[PDB]
Amino acid sequence: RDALKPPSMYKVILVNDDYTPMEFVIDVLQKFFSYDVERATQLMLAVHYQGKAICGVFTAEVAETKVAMVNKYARENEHPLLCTLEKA
């Protein structure tokens, strides 16, 4: 059913928490979004100070893989770090 034409795009959001180490979030940003350290740190800080930030905007499938991978990587490392998606 439905239609055609452009795909819907999705924002990948990182949410702030009080317990995930900053160093860890930086690592996530390099590892899963190809940020260098400089940009990664600034983005971590945007999250830290603003409570949430957009890490990237992607097609639905790419976005979901990022989110799934980010959250799995956080839990496996015993951090509550939450990554979520938003339709752009």
Partner: peptide, 10 residues
């Protein structure tokens, strides 16, 4: 997030 004093180069 939580810092551990590194820190931070940005």
């Amino acid at each position: 997030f939580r810092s551990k004093g590194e820190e931070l180069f940005t």
